Design an enzyme around this catalytic site. Sequence first.
Site, PDB file in Angstrom:
ATOM      1  N   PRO D  76      -0.515  -8.792  -2.990  1.00 12.93           N
ATOM      2  CA  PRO D  76      -1.047 -10.124  -2.693  1.00 12.93           C
ATOM      3  C   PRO D  76      -2.494 -10.139  -2.175  1.00 12.93           C
ATOM      4  CG  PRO D  76       0.296  -9.402  -0.882  1.00 12.93           C
ATOM      5  CD  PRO D  76       0.480  -8.380  -1.978  1.00 12.93           C
ATOM      6  N   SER D 105      -0.196 -14.532  -3.372  1.00 13.88           N
ATOM      7  CA  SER D 105      -0.603 -14.774  -1.996  1.00 13.88           C
ATOM      8  C   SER D 105      -0.386 -16.234  -1.602  1.00 13.88           C
ATOM      9  CB  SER D 105      -2.083 -14.408  -1.836  1.00 13.88           C
ATOM     10  OG  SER D 105      -2.654 -15.040  -0.712  1.00 13.88           O
ATOM     11  N   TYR D 128       2.316 -16.295   4.562  1.00 13.75           N
ATOM     12  CA  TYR D 128       1.592 -16.337   5.827  1.00 13.75           C
ATOM     13  C   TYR D 128       2.196 -17.563   6.517  1.00 13.75           C
ATOM     14  CZ  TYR D 128      -2.379 -13.175   4.726  1.00 13.75           C
ATOM     15  OH  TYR D 128      -3.182 -12.093   4.446  1.00 13.75           O
ATOM     16  N   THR D 153       3.646 -11.185   5.605  1.00 12.68           N
ATOM     17  CA  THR D 153       2.470 -10.430   6.053  1.00 12.68           C
ATOM     18  C   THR D 153       2.254 -10.737   7.528  1.00 12.68           C
ATOM     19  OG1 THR D 153       1.458 -10.417   3.878  1.00 12.68           O
ATOM     20  CG2 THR D 153      -0.014 -10.154   5.750  1.00 12.68           C
ATOM     21  N   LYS D 228       5.298  -6.831   5.644  1.00 12.66           N
ATOM     22  CA  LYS D 228       4.055  -6.145   5.321  1.00 12.66           C
ATOM     23  C   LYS D 228       3.089  -6.144   6.506  1.00 12.66           C
ATOM     24  CE  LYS D 228       0.346  -6.626   1.725  1.00 12.66           C
ATOM     25  NZ  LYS D 228      -0.829  -7.238   2.405  1.00 12.66           N
ATOM     26  N   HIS D 252      -3.966  -3.619   5.717  1.00 15.86           N
ATOM     27  CA  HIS D 252      -4.650  -4.699   5.026  1.00 15.86           C
ATOM     28  C   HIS D 252      -5.941  -4.230   4.374  1.00 15.86           C
ATOM     29  CE1 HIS D 252      -3.848  -9.127   5.057  1.00 15.86           C
ATOM     30  NE2 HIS D 252      -5.082  -9.190   4.589  1.00 15.86           N
ATOM     31  N   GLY D 283      -6.277   1.774   0.407  1.00 14.99           N
ATOM     32  CA  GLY D 283      -7.040   2.966   0.081  1.00 14.99           C
ATOM     33  C   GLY D 283      -6.773   3.607  -1.271  1.00 14.99           C
ATOM     34  N   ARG D 305      -7.643  -3.786  -4.066  1.00 12.99           N
ATOM     35  CA  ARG D 305      -8.956  -3.857  -4.697  1.00 12.99           C
ATOM     36  C   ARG D 305      -9.028  -3.226  -6.093  1.00 12.99           C
ATOM     37  NH1 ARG D 305     -10.194  -2.687   0.493  1.00 12.99           N
ATOM     38  NH2 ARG D 305     -11.557  -4.049   1.743  1.00 12.99           N
TER      39      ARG D 305
END
Lengths: 353, 353, 353, 353
Positions: D76, D105, D128, D153, D228, D252, D283, D305
């Site tokens: 998300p 998301s 959220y 999250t 999460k 995050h 990462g 990403r």
Amino acid sequence: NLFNVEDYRKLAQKRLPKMVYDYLEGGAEDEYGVKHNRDVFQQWRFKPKRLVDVSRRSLQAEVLGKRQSMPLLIGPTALNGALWPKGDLALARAATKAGIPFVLSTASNMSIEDLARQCDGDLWFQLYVIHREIAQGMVLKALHTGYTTLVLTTDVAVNGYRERDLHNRFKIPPFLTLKNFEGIDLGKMDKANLEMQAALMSRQMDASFNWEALRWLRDLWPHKLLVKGLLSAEDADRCIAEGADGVILSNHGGRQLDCAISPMEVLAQSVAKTGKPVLIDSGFRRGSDIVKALALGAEAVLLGRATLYGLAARGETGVDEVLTLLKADIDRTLAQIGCPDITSLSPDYLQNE
Amino acid sequence: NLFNVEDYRKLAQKRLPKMVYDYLEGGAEDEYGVKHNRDVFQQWRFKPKRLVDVSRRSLQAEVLGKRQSMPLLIGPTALNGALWPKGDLALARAATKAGIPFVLSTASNMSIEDLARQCDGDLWFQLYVIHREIAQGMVLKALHTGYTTLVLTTDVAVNGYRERDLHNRFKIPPFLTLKNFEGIDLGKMDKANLEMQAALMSRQMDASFNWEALRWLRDLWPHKLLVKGLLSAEDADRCIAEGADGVILSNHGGRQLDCAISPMEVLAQSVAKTGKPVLIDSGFRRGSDIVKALALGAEAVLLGRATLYGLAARGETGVDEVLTLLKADIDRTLAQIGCPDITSLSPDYLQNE
Amino acid sequence: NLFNVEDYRKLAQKRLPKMVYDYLEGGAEDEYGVKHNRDVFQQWRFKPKRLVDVSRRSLQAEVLGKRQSMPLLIGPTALNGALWPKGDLALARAATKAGIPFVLSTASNMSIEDLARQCDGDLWFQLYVIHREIAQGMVLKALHTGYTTLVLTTDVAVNGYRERDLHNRFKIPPFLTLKNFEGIDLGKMDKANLEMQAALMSRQMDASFNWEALRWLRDLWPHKLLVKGLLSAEDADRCIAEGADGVILSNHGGRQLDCAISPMEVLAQSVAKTGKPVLIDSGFRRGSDIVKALALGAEAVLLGRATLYGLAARGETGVDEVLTLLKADIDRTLAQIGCPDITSLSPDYLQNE
Amino acid sequence: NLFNVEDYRKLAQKRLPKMVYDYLEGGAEDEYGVKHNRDVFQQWRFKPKRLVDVSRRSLQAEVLGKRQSMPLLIGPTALNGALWPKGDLALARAATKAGIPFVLSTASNMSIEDLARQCDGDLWFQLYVIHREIAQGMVLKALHTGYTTLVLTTDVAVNGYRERDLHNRFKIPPFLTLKNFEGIDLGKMDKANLEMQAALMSRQMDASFNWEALRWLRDLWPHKLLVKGLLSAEDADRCIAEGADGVILSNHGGRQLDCAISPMEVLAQSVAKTGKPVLIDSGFRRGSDIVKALALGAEAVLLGRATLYGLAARGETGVDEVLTLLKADIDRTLAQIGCPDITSLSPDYLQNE
Ligand SMILES: Cc1cc2nc3c(=O)[nH]c(=O)nc-3n(C[C@H](O)[C@H](O)[C@H](O)COP(=O)(O)O)c2cc1C
Ligand SMILES: Cc1cc2nc3c(=O)[nH]c(=O)nc-3n(C[C@H](O)[C@H](O)[C@H](O)COP(=O)(O)O)c2cc1C
Ligand SMILES: Cc1cc2nc3c(=O)[nH]c(=O)nc-3n(C[C@H](O)[C@H](O)[C@H](O)COP(=O)(O)O)c2cc1C
Ligand SMILES: Cc1cc2nc3c(=O)[nH]c(=O)nc-3n(C[C@H](O)[C@H](O)[C@H](O)COP(=O)(O)O)c2cc1C
Ligand SMILES: O=C(O)[C@@H](O)Cc1c[nH]c2ccccc12
Ligand SMILES: O=C(O)[C@@H](O)Cc1c[nH]c2ccccc12
Ligand SMILES: O=C(O)[C@@H](O)Cc1c[nH]c2ccccc12
Ligand SMILES: O=C(O)[C@@H](O)Cc1c[nH]c2ccccc12
């Protein structure tokens, strides 16, 4: 100004077409692997033994029972003909002149027979298995032509993702050919002979080759047999259990899997577990790197890029030069640490950093 | 702006011919050794003792039983005459003025006798053995001329591979000579006297000099005797067992074997095992480096390049300056950690990083 | 774009005369110390506690029994008047406005009395002892003027070798004076009164001040007393044994001894041994640095250069800004790790890297 | 030349407006966190198992009991519409085409319903909680529209201090909207309905959401539920105790707390303690990063990403490409280490560096 291997690399990069240079110097993905292969040597430092008579030094040593001028070998590397004309021969001749073995790659530009006919040094044959049947053919050829040792390379199940070649769209030079595969019959219309062409038009190897297959090969080859590409004392021990006369710890010069450990990381343990000859390569550039591995129990070190830099820079004379510098380098190092006889090296002269 | 040793190096590099500067600053092969000699000092940090009266500090200390202004010495370095005219004398005089010993190299540009005649400080003689017979001659000369201590350097069995000199094709300046060898008879036609010329025309030392040879030397020299070039508590202990009054842990300022450990790595252990004076050098540039070694048990630190930078930059006055800054540096450091008397230093003031 | 302390440093360097900037930012010798003060914070990382109600957070905390808006203080720094006009006052006012204490340096540009008269926040007085007699005078002044806490700085027996000032030949601005020393009688012709001038014309402190002297001071001062400059649990424990109400672990912002450990290295141990308030400074720039020390047991963190950057860049408003950002920084960090109440911090939220 | 994720980042930076690129690539404060997320992967190296038949490999694997083409998911991420038109849909479609889940998301530019109507792959909904009441509405919407899994999250109690956005004064593109919030009634004049607007005009979340609140949510959602934002085996274990079917270890992508540990640091421990599915992100860029986490016990890795670079650079086709390269990357890696079946990965193939 050619006083070390690095100087030859510099010279080689100036003379080679970028594409070829990248093929030679490049590694897998980020290339953290090749950097690691180099860095790992700093984890050890010397603790010389003073007031030892080193006026008479000896680098001679037995490798698999046979004596040679020094614990070094020019390892198997593909497409040497792209680095310099008749590169394979130039290498074998410098090796023979230096008194050490030479290993011909299955993917050499000069066939097993032609080399054996043009060179009388100790020739070893490295083997890749694309097609079991074709594999048996090369092994027998190497056998009938006098090759004393067979080396099975196992770390190329699939080809390493080498991004330098990808960017450059690297392509085997036109005037060069995989000579050990040339001539392989393409006339048969039946079963094999057609599935064989499938392997032959497939730049991909037999990823199924397993321990059972090693047994097959152990029977076929009657002389000294080594398994190359190992990165664990466990695998090295199994190889010995399955018949191997020794093993070659290596990560293919960081060209197969970027995050692979350096074989230096499992050298002592493999030596302690197998109780058999443990050779090594990957990252060696200085005599000190060589002595450290030897001090840790390695039987001998195979040179990959080091001697190739000499080949690319100045052909056969270049290899001689590199071998000369390295021998002088090793000798000088033995003297410095107070170990006049290379066969007396031990963990004693080392310090874990 | 000359406030530390580094400032003198900068100044020296501006005044020296590149070739000479490289001879002075250079190290073996990759020069990872010299970098390491410097870095190793960061493995320790200070834990000052507060509210201690440091209004009255003392740097005085005994070295081999003899008191001197501070636990420092200008170590033996060859070809000082190339850095500055009568470099050897300029060094001995600054040392004597600072109240500390000076060690004349076997390869000095000023002979054992001339220096002793022109300088009345505490002179020590460092000895290299090219030819046993010629060695005995120099030892006796140094003996008859008043040198209080003899130092046998053992880490130059063979010459270190210093690539800077190789690139520059370094050559001893024409106007300079190895004065301690000058005059050595070349007329005799018999046995020695001709094999001696073999050693004399051979810029290579007696690599056979061993423990038995140390015994020989121990008998010849009646005063304080130290063995220099050690890199192991074991070797230092043997030296004591063989007669040495003390040892000098060192890697020749990283000029002999690039991958050698820093002597700092075996200082505490050598101190604990020998129970005898353990001196050290290699990498010292700051007073803090000096105090750390002292806190670890070193009896005194020998300066190599540090004082040479002062010599090359500003001759004798330059050395005085370097010695002054360092003394002030040491004093300031003692005050800061709360150890007013340098002889009270101990591992207590240190923190392993 | 001013969103963190670093942005204020940048702005301060653009507005300050190089000489003054170097006086502020500079450290001892190589300045490995200041770098270390910063790096040491990376040895710890956070392990947030999720699903914790942090909708209502509190940064309030008691320091030596007195509650203040947050566990921070503007520590004692000399010559603030050189960074900005009436710098001392600008700092005390921003501190008071933020609800935290301010510590006036013995070497401030505004006297103990004038500040107390112009500021009603919680004022603490840091004391250096040049002359015992003059020391007693300042202590009593601070006492009679309402200063709640006295801080004895002990890590300046001698002045740190700060090469930046040496190169710049730093000199206290002409229009600035050491106001706490101004007026000190210079008329007496007898004993003291003349040996006092010796101390007064001597920019050097009483290096003899020891534990016995601490006892003297403990009797003189009736309120809260802290010893600053400690770098060992042992020294901190002794201070408590001698009467101190707490201690301040610090290496003077890396300005006294380049190789000193970071006080963060002995914070937990000092906290465990003393069982008394342990404050700290040196290297703090981010709220995360602050929380890590707090999580380790520190009672509060004193800011040195951080708030000074705000002063130099934008005077009083600059300090307010820095204090605001840091408070928001701390608050945000507490929320992120799931510790709504700053007084509940513990080693639990940390991970040793 | 697009052969890895990094190449797509490069391309994305050339095509995105700096402001948007910074929103995507940026991290908290100094951004030591994101660097750490990357570096932590070098703490592990491979120890391949040779002579293993890898001619037939399988990346298929069950995630929470449901089989998918490979142990990967597109995690998300908010404001995908700013990276590329209908970014949310482009991502879900590439995910579905690759045979892996996609997580929408709460702050997506395409509503829960519209996506579900335009995409039939396995859709997961990340949640959220700004306002409990509004939260229940979205959960039910996602429930009625077929979303198979819900992800809570928890690491955004407060917004991370992302200085890149601060400098750029980042602002949600005008043509983009938080579509999952659009339509939320603003007519009611009573209690909620007005305190709700307080939450709705407040870009800040319910920092009070705690374990009790997790129970509330566990009852509301009848299907698979994951928490999460966890960074500790302890918190992961509690989540399982409270009803969660699994957890997602993550920081995050280094965007919330710069000094947070990498979830890789607590993966093995969380796996050993919970005995339940432990997924991870933050990462990941190379197949090797993915395999290392898998070898350590992770059930699957969520991409953040990585796939977004493909989206920003070349939209939907870009994501397909990234997913293709990564699948090939993973497959190639499995082959190299001798683990033909991805479900057979274990700590055996790893070496702690
Ligand atoms: C250009 C090049 C080609 C290679 N070709 C082969 C090959 O055909 N067979 C083989 O067994 N190893 C091959 N290798 C690996 C080498 O045998 C050796 O493991 C490796 O180069 C050792 O590392 P180093 O280059 O750092 O010395 C090759 C390496 C390079 C650099
Ligand atoms: C230019 C130069 C010449 C040297 N010559 C000698 C020598 O003649 N005899 C000897 O015992 N050591 C010799 N050394 C080694 C020094 O005694 C000393 O071990 C070394 O410089 C210590 O390291 P440092 O330079 O970092 O202080 C020499 C070092 C340098 C830099
Ligand atoms: C410009 C400057 C002047 C200082 N003057 C004093 C002083 O007069 N008295 C004192 O106790 N400490 C003094 N200190 C040390 C500070 O109290 C504090 O220990 C130090 O700055 C903490 O480190 P930091 O700058 O990284 O925060 C000074 C520091 C700086 C940077
Ligand atoms: C542009 C961007 C927006 C994000 N938005 C959200 C969000 O709306 N909900 C959520 O749960 N995580 C969000 N995340 C975090 C991701 O789910 C994931 O944890 C993170 O990106 C993993 O790290 P990586 O980017 O190195 O893969 C976001 C990350 C980025 C880079
Ligand atoms: O990385 C390596 O060592 C191989 O890819 C060399 C190699 C290049 N072309 C070939 C054809 C058949 C077998 C091996 C090769
Ligand atoms: O590295 C060193 O310290 C020596 O090589 C110095 C050295 C230079 N020329 C010499 C002749 C005889 C003995 C030693 C020397
Ligand atoms: O480094 C420090 O903190 C001191 O040197 C400050 C300082 C500057 N001038 C002074 C005069 C008397 C006492 C202290 C000072
Ligand atoms: O960092 C993150 O992941 C969030 O800030 C995304 C985010 C951006 N705008 C929002 C409005 C409501 C809830 C979350 C968001």
